[PDB]
Amino acid sequence: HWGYGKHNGPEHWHKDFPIAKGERQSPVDIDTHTAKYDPSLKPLSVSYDQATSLRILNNGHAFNVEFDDSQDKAVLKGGPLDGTYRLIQFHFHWGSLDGQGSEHTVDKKKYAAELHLVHWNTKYGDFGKAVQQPDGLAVLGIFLKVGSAKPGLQKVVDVLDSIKTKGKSADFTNFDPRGLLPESLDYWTYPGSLTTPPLLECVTWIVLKEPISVSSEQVLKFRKLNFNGEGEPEELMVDNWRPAQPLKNRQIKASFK
Numbered sequence: 001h002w003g004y005g006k007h008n009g010p011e012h013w014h015k016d017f018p019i020a021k022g023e024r025q026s027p028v029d030i031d032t033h034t035a036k037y038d039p040s041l042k043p044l045s046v047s048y049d050q051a052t053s054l055r056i057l058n059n060g061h062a063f064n065v066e067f068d069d070s071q072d073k074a075v076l077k078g079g080p081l082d083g084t085y086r087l088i089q090f091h092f093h094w095g096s097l098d099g100q101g102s103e104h105t106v107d108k109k110k111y112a113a114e115l116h117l118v119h120w121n122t123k124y125g126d127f128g129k130a131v132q133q134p135d136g137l138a139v140l141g142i143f144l145k146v147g148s149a150k151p152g153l154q155k156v157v158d159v160l161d162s163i164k165t166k167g168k169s170a171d172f173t174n175f176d177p178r179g180l181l182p183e184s185l186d187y188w189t190y191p192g193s194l195t196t197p198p199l200l201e202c203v204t205w206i207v208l209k210e211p212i213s214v215s216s217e218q219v220l221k222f223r224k225l226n227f228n229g230e231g232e233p234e235e236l237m238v239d240n241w242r243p244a245q246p247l248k249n250r251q252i253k254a255s256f257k
């Protein structure tokens with residue numbers, strides 16, 4: 001099965017998921033000088049006041065914090081979007097070292113990690129139908145740099161020891177994802193894909209310019225997770241990022257400057 005190793009990592013994915021070589025794959029390098037300021041872009045509207053987290057899961061690739069998406073509760077709208085997108089889960093990608101881990105890059109800069117808040121377009125009724133559509137998902141991407149701790153992250157960090165290995169889950173209620181946002185909602189946007197198999201070309205990417213800071217100790221705890229299941233040989237969950245893919249026929253637009 002696919003993963004992030006030498007034998008099953010990003011360069012192999014195309015053999016099971018040939019869309020890996022498609023026309024709108026993610027992530028990409030954001031060349032900030034060539035990104036077009038678009039005065040028609042609206043402010044992003046992030047409405048997470050009624051978000052209801054339920055559980056956190058080690059899926060063998062990353063961990064997902066899941067939300068009840070059965071009502072209209074935690075929604076993303078505006079920005080480049082038409083319509084209303086409901087939060088279903090967030091997860092991260094991170095490195096073995098502070099100098100790598102993000103999926104998107106900014107003028108070839110890698111960040112230590114990248115947060116993905118995944119939302120599906122309510123016009124398609126549920127997530128599984130949304131991923132079959134070109135405007136099915138909106139993923140809000142936020143870079144992480146190492147510096148001062150992110151206090152709103154610590155509840156996630158502390159639960160990680162209970163989901164160390166593939167397939168473990170733990171109740172995770174009352175987690176407020178507003179505590180993971182930077183101060184500014186200035187962003188870049190472009191059309192792309194899921195960054196893991198099945199690599200479906202269903203995502204409007206919205207990547208915030210301002211990173212959040214997390215501490216060295218917080219990222220260290222991400223790196224103690226394991227890609228293996230309980231009772232199998234330990235493989236630290238590190239370097240679970242896909243490298244930048246060809247931009248092909250796409251324009252990255254900026255909401256700012």
Ligand SMILES: CCCSc1ccc(S(N)(=O)=O)cc1
Nearest residue numbers: 001002007008012013015016
């Ligand atoms: C059960 C592991 C078989 S080896 C292998 C299987 C699948 C992949 S893929 N194309 O990355 O999904 C890569 C390596």
Ligand SMILES: CCCSc1ccc(S(N)(=O)=O)cc1
Nearest residue numbers: 116118131139193194195196
């Ligand atoms: C369709 C099953 C995969 S769900 C899924 C896979 C990848 C992402 S990502 N890393 O945000 O593009 C978001 C959701």
Ligand SMILES: [Zn+2]
Nearest residue numbers: 092093116195
């Ligand atoms: Zn992701």
